[PDB]
Amino acid sequence: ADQKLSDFHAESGGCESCHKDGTPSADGAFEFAQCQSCHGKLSEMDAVHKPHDGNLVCADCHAVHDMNVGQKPTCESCHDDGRTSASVLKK
Numbered sequence: 466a467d468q469k470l471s472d473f474h475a476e477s478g479g480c481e482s483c484h485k486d487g488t489p490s491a492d493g494a495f496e497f498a499q500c501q502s503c504h505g506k507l508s509e510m511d512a513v514h515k516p517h518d519g520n521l522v523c524a525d526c527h528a529v530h531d532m533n534v535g536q537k538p539t540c541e542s543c544h545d546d547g548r549t550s551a552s553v554l555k556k
């Protein structure tokens with residue numbers, strides 16, 4: 466069955482893996498800290514991730530409830546040059 470990223474994570478730690486008491490915060494800071502607690506920091510990631518260190522939280526790209534496992538974010542919501550992850554990773 467198609468699984469969202471939120472659901473995939475919840476199978477290995479519950480909704481509380483990312484949300485205090487399984488309940489979302491208003492400003493997403495708690496959740497961003499959880500993402501980084503397992504995955505590390507943007508500055509230690511690849512070329513798509515690094516420039517966003519200090520500017521974005523993970524959820525500004527990864528819409529974990531809306532996106533399938535496997536589905537990755539695109540760039541057009543914030544950049545107007547047609548860039549893709551491919552165009553940046555394999556620059």
Ligand code: HEC
Nearest residue numbers: 471474475479480482483484489490491492493496524529
């Ligand atoms: C981390 C991989 C997550 C897991 C596991 C689950 N959710 Fe989540 N959810 C996550 C983020 C980054 C956000 C947005 C930021 C925020 O502040 O939370 C969300 C959002 C939701 C929402 C919407 C909140 C809003 O519209 O005000 C809800 C209701 C929500 N999440 C519920 C929820 C449940 C019930 C989960 C377990 C099945 C669950 N989330 C897991 C990240 C993650």
Ligand code: HEC
Nearest residue numbers: 474478482483496497499500502503504523524527529535
């Ligand atoms: C530890 C308890 C975690 C928290 C909190 C979050 N993630 Fe996670 N994530 C974790 C594991 C062990 C895995 C599986 C290994 C893998 O890399 O696949 C994942 C996976 C993802 C993925 C998929 C990566 C891929 O294989 O293509 C994404 C994109 C991802 N996680 C994002 C992410 C975000 C945005 C989180 C906070 C909202 C988050 N994870 C929390 C472990 C943990």
Ligand code: HEC
Nearest residue numbers: 500501504505506507511513517521522523526537538550
């Ligand atoms: C938009 C600018 C993003 C932000 C902010 C974060 N991620 Fe991301 N992530 C994005 C894309 C387009 C992709 C696919 C291309 C790639 O660079 O690999 C990813 C991929 C991941 C993965 C898998 C990496 C792999 O080698 O397979 C993980 C686990 C992941 N992203 C996690 C993650 C976390 C935890 C973030 C906040 C610290 C985060 N990403 C931010 C786009 C974007």
Ligand code: HEC
Nearest residue numbers: 513516517520525526538539540542543544548549550553
């Ligand atoms: C808004 C939520 C964003 C999304 C989606 C993506 N990026 Fe981004 N990017 C964002 C900010 C706030 C910044 C800081 C500099 C700026 O443009 O104002 C960046 C920066 C980059 C850069 C550095 C070079 C530059 O254009 O400034 C790269 C290489 C970059 N962003 C790549 C990139 C890719 C590949 C994305 C889609 C996966 C992507 N960004 C999404 C904000 C946002």
